[PDB]
Amino acid sequence: KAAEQYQGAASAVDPAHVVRTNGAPDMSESEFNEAKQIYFQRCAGCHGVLRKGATGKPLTPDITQQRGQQYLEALITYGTPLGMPNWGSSGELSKEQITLMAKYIQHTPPQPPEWGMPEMRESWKVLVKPEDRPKKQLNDLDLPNLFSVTLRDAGQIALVDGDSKKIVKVIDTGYAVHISRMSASGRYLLVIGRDARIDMIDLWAKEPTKVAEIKIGIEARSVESSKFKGYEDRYTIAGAYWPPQFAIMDGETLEPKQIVSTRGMTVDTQTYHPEPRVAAIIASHEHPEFIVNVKETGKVLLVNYKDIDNLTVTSIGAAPFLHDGGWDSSHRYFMTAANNSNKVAVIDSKDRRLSALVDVGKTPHPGRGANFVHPKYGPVWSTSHLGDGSISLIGTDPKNHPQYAWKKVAELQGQGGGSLFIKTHPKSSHLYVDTTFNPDARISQSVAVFDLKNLDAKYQVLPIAEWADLGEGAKRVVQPEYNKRGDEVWFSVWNGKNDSSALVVVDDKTLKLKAVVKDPRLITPTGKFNVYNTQHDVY
Template identity: 45%
Template sequence: MHKKALSKGIFALSFPLAAMMAGGVQADAPEMTAEEMDRAGNIYFQRCAGCHGTLRGGATGPGLLPEDTIGMGQRRLESIITLGTEGGMNNFDGILDPEEITLISKYIQQPPEEPPEMSLADIRETWKIIVPEEEWPDSPQHDLNWENFMVTILRDRGAMGIIDGDTKQLVTEAETGYAVHVAKSSSDGRFWYVQGRDGRLSKIDLWMDPPQVTAEVFIGIDARDVAVSKYGEWENKYVIGGGYWPPHFVIADAHTMEPLKVVSTRGYNTKGEYVHEARVAALYDTPMAPSFLVNVKETGMIWQVDYSDLENLRIDKIESAEFLHDGFFDSTGRYFMIAANFSNRMAFVDTVERKLVSLLDTGAIPHPGPGANWVDPECGPVAGTTHLGEGRMSFWGTDPENYPEHAWQICDIVETDGPGLFLRSHPNSPHVWIDQSMHPEADVNQWIQVMNKETRELTPIHVADRPAEHDAVALHFEYDQSGEEVWVSIWARGRGHQEDGAIVIFDDKTMEEKARVENLYTPTGKFNVYNRKAKYKHG
């Protein structure tokens, strides 16, 4: 059943995941029909599984098994889902209607059931060539400045919006997987690889007119991240996708998208406990070695997977802390920094030596997103993170050679008005831009903070300017090709208002609004081609 659904390329709303997971109604749980179970399962997959786990065993969020939920009672469960929590869970009163909140509250009191596994043969059945290589253009088919395109996640639309950074016009919407988490490019920026939550890994060619998907493959039925090889002779040779379910990673041919190898990530955590649902949270290519970093969320293990010989795969397993999520590199490309968010720590890895350098307590549930590097007048090169659990931005030193006293130590903590998801900066910018999107109130989550790198002072800016029924938050920052503009998303999540999203464009120096791109369907992350191309050339 799952292979048929995957081959059609349909996402959660018509995906039979709920039926696979529904293990029958718990005796002392609220009664539910099969139709209600299926509907609630789809809601859970779309909105809840990322934090609470496909099997509801918990991760960044707590476990939602019957033994965790039945004793809480229907009314309390509905209240938590409606209003959110101070621990970092956002409110769903504008995202789900009251009937859906009641439904999902009943659902999480039922026993879960494992969805099916996927073999390499299963994955290969989903591989699809959409535009044959002989039809690829030899040069751009349009006269647009494609290196200043903003490849933009239209989260609930199941597409990537390609926006011209020069004209501020939407060029096209490329159909991809549902709720794409991130996008990664080939080293020249022409091709973009995006991983949908439904497991669909898509390749987009920006030279086509309009840009479009050339090939795709489903690497699982729930997934988050992707990376492309960029080192030496393996440049642009492999692409890797990581599964939440099944818990594995898949290496494919980056040219054709043919799946080549699948590797399970089940294993033992840092305490020596076996983890069945050991999900792949984040994937990165290492600039100084022919390897991918595979961050296994529940185990706290960072796998450095050497792709120079797929038949004799070398994997260095680096112990850090649970639960791994988003990460980024320091300004040199040697040190990888990732949030072990439920451990309230950042982990630092030397990718040349392939070993853990340090662990650092930063605050409640760090979440750097793509992160930010800059130079602090006191601590030298630094990097920072926002937090899901509290309103703060913490930053630390990253230069063990020239500033050893500050390396992997907190340089400063800047208090914001609420928890956030993203921060961003640019080498030529005097600022660090910080969102507050996880706060439940519009008078905080529609505002951002801009920190002066020299003084560490914050300037609040009202971005979203949307009525309450839009349930809109301001989040995620990206600089344009010039490094002079900062693009900020307005994610309108309210039911019936998803098309009221926008991107607001600011002058980085003056912090004044310059332009807007309106009528976007749930825009979240965006990625400038020029800025996201391979920054480091080694090997």
């Protein structure tokens, strides 16, 4: 009764400014569920789960009710030239569906479930206790030259022996695994599906088998291991798309320890954003931290694991829409692309600061990038683009080449836009770039190769898809990846699940076809990650 009067004063909030939602077109339970079913299959990626706008404009009731029914239907139908697909013209969605979507986006967005520690512990499993795991490598596999290839639509990954070109094992994982990452010791393989299911695989057991797993969210893209000296296999971190968050777990058993929300203020307008999806994550070699990229808010956070109980985080403003990126040759600056901002943020991991924001081309997509010493400009880091066919070379040596540091020092020209990965290797004198999503078939089925010993000359075209001899299908080639020796470059010919695919190997020394890996179990192969190169960031 004392506690009653103590909190018995009015809230400073003005009810007239608290807004009730509604005034949308009446639509039944089924009309709504069908619209909801379509929204995540076709729209959520670009517009966001909450519809506050990611790559695309906000689709919340305030704005959609203002536009009204007809503007909405027409827009969804014909699309626009700035990224909005023509769902009606292309005949991808019927007029009836487009009508339901126009009505759906006029209601309050349905709420997706949260996902904290209770759900994480319930999903967590230790398949083989640490004490029951091999003390030595119980097999004759050349682990360093192994490849962890993603069999996207099969919810599996494949361990392919680099020298023999044969599949050594197919392991069940999360659906469409996005990337593979190696532990600092080179013993454990870490794969994470887009569904946020992480699988830890012991490469030492008789046969590479799974020793632990967990689900850190409803949707995810990144996973990483602690690499600072004295912290081998200590912690594993993973970033989720929804909910906006990242989790730190034990690097031996994947036991969840800390969960941190990334919901916050943007760097540009400094207003509140409800869905800042976590993207790339890279382990720092300069301090005991993980370097996390928060997309929609454009913040690079340095999560310090020196004391995992009292988490110290340093919020660095970069630029909106941070995505992928990698280390420069020295492994001190984090070159990451803020793709929809057309800039490349450089994060100094030693001095823990933003070194610069470099203007590049339309929608940079470096992947992890390509590092090499330019004969004139010195040490550079490069990236290709999705929005155009240009290739940016950036200065990454402040000590010996300060006049070029953090500048778009030169530009190269590929086959065209739709590019996703650019590759190279220390031992190699070639530079490869794919064009996976280029709207042309001939271009999307081939890669461009440049001569680093003569960058003035144009690129040669390698007909990767044609070399694979597969037959029908889009046969989109993607992500060049070298072997440990650096004399073989691998490519994935990403064909439909009901079609036939392959991994095409090329002799880097001669640019001649070396081999083609086919197998009924090689369903929709995407990411290939050579152990050594992924473990030691060789790119």
